[PDB]
Design a protein around this nucleic acid. Structure first.
Ligand code: MG
Ligand code: MG
Ligand code: MG
Ligand code: MG
Ligand code: MG
Ligand code: MG
Ligand code: MG
Ligand code: MG
Lengths: 48, 59, 164, 138
RNA sequence: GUCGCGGCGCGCCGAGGGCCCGACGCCUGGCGGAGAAUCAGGGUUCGACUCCGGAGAGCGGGCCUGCGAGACGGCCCGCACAUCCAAGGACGGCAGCAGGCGCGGAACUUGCCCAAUGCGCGGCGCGCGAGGCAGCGACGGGGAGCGCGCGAGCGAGGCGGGCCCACAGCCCCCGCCGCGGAGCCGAGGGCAAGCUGGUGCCAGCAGCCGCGGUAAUUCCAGCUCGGCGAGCGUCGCGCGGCGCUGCUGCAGUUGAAACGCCCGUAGUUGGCCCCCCGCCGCCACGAGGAAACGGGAGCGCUCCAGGCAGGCCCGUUGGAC
RNA sequence: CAUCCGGUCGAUCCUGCCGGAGCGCGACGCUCUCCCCAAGGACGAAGCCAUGCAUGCCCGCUCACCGGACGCGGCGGAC
């Protein structure tokens, strides 16, 4: 009835990803040097 | 490493005095700088004086 | 009015008409990694310069060889390219210019020229030292990574005398 | 052919193009002037008015409001985008209203709506939706 | 009459002048150009604003001085506004610099100085809200950064000394100590980027197609991921997309579109032929005529946006075209 | 610096338009470490204006006061 009727997990406090070029360097090794299927469940299953 | 500039050597002291911007003399240790006066007050005085007639030396 | 109104100004880069293109993204990331590019504006700048050179070369090439203007402008362009090290010395015909590539422009950046001399371990290390003013060209120290060295100045690059 | 092609025929081609360029709907809309006089915004990016009444193949009631432009005094209808944003809008309140994506035509399944609310009481609606700003002054 | 020609004005005479190669009239959210935006080529839109020219100083008129004004930080009048009055009287024109109200979607300090460029009057200078310096300033443009590697180093920032400055800053240089901080959009397609919990055609998303009625790949949240990046997104306008205004370069049997047919003026288009003359168009060259912008030769403001410079033994150094 | 993509159907080929993709000029929203350059009440209100400033200089004429005031005169104020 009340509008916004449709409208909390603790935030994963982890070290920030590097900023600037260092971020660019991360993806370069992420897709080539490091073993990857980008975004499927099985990849996320492995990382846990 | 490098610094460049200009100099000016005068034949005599008087020639320096006659040919020299005042602020240059003040920067150098030659003469003494009078205390500054605001030009706004000078303009106010000038307009007030122009307002008066005849002998306007009072203000 | 103010004298500052007569100062000139201009942009220095061009953005792609089609932004999302997989091969282009892959190639741009590849180039950024090899040459340690801070962002994607440097690639656009390089493309801009290459386009300018290519257009000049085209316009000159459309004319006859024995044209006074053609000789004048071709000589000027070739001299500039040779001095800047983009084009090889042995090439003197205008045709070779149109085949140039931005990699040639990139290879003359300060980071690259110090890395090829073995004075730095990597492009990223080179950038880190450059930002910390530890390098010198001739008798002067340059702290701009994008500074472009000339062929006659390649052998005069060293480490800053005052650098610790 | 079907077009005049003589060496001394520039005038005829000019007048032909002049007459026939008026048949394009977009060109008429842009360079005729009727649209300019009819458009409530009078060619402006957005305008300012006052709220006067909150009102309502997809079957989804939408929340909107009636506005009266200050500079022009005419009445229009505006739509409140975000979820639960109607509460931030009170009767007799000053708003800033802009257009939709399409210039003039209606957008989406909303019938006869061509304006959007973006600022209320001097605070961005989207900012209030994310709690960046607050309406405790009102 | 005028500095002066002239229906510029007056008297007389005669009748003419302009028009589909568009007169006259009406409208304009109409100052013009040099130029700006966009981008195969051909083009389309804009042109308040830096240089030139024009017009105006609340509206409409008149005038003195002067070589030069129909002047408005000069005077007179009417109209509309506005101020002081010890009520009889007097008095004003920010579309100049700051500043205030109103209006609007929208726009800065009631600062310092004549030191530089110039103007006015003048002999060893005065004055200039022209102009210069500073302040606010995410209109906007350019250059660096939030690490590298197994130890060091480096910034921002703070405190002093120089340099500069009309005086103060700022940049740059020398010493001591030393804060490393990323957001905005999105993940069904166009278009690069996927797993849990809620809600249940409700709430909401959605430029277009579409989603939502019990796994919602699209709503609301968490995780993860993508693009640009000190910037990102939304709204309106212009160019492009668009060979959907078509000269280059559209279409006209059935999709929108060949007048029912003939004659015919204006208009447009018109076979072949003379070698050498004249005229018109055409091509090439040249003279003359502002720069700035644009192109372009040369120069390491640390690079760059920029600017016209610098070292020494300088084309007469150069600023070509 | 010569580029196209999604949408009418049970499927298919066209015409045709709707929408997306780029640049620039402004306004709104979120955010912002350092330096350089830099526009800034124009947008059917050429609407209305407190307050201060924006045009002076000097050779000629001194029985003024201790020659400098002031005044007449000259140039400029039409840039
Ligand atoms: Mg007008
Ligand atoms: Mg002018
Ligand atoms: Mg005038
Ligand atoms: Mg007048
Ligand atoms: Mg005047
Ligand atoms: Mg005035
Ligand atoms: Mg039919
Ligand atoms: Mg038909």
């Amino acid at each position: 009835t009340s509008a916004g009727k449709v409208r909390k997990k603790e935030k994963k406090e982890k070290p920030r990803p590097p900023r600037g070029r260092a971020y660019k360097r991360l993806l370069y090794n992420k897709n080539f040097v490091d073993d990857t299927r980008l975004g499927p469940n099985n990849l996320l299953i492995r990382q846990k | 490493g490098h610094t460049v500039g200009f100099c000016n050597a005068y034949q005599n002291m008087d020639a320096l005095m006659k040919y020299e911007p005042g602020f240059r003399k003040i920067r150098c240790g030659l003469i003494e700088a009078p205390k500054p006066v605001s030009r706004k007050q000078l303009k106010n005085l000038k307009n007030r004086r122009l307002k008066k007639r005849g002998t306007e030396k009072a203000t | 009015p103010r004298i500052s109104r007569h100062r000139n100004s201009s942009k220095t880069y061009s953005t792609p008409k089609k932004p999302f293109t997989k091969p282009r993204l892959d190639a741009e990331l590849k180039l950024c990694g090899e040459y340690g590019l801070k962002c994607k504006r440097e690639i656009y700048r390089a493309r801009y310069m290459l386009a300018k050179i290519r257009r000049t070369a085209r316009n000159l090439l459309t004319l006859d060889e024995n044209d006074i203007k053609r000789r004048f402008e071709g000589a000027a362009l070739l001299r500039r390219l040779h001095m800047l090290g983009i084009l090889d010395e042995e090439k003197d015909q205008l045709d070779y210019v149109l085949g140039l590539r931005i990699e040639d422009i990139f290879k003359r950046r300060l980071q690259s020229v110090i890395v090829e001399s073995k004075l730095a371990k990597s492009v990223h290390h080179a950038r880190n030292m450059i930002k910390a003013r530890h390098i010198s060209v001739g008798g002067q120290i340059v702290n701009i990574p994008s500074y472009m060295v000339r062929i006659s100045n390649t052998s005069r690059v060293a480490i800053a005398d005052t650098s610790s | 052919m079907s077009k005049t092609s003589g060496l001394y025929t520039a005038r005829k081609l000019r007048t032909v193009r002049r007459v026939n360029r008026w048949a394009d709907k977009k060109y008429r809309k842009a360079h005729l002037g009727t649209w300019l006089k009819a458009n409530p915004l009078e060619g402006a990016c957005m305008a300012r008015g006052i709220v006067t009444q909150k009102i309502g193949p997809n079957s989804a009631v939408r929340k909107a409001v009636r506005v009266q432009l200050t500079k022009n005094s005419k009445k229009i209808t505006a739509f409140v985008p975000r979820d639960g944003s109607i509460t931030y809008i009170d009767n007799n309140d000053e708003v800033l209203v802009a257009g939709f994506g399409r210039a003039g035509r209606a957008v989406g399944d909303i019938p006869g709506c061509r304006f959007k609310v973006i600022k209320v009481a001097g605070i961005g609606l989207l900012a209030l939706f994310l709690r960046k700003r607050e309406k405790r002054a009102r």
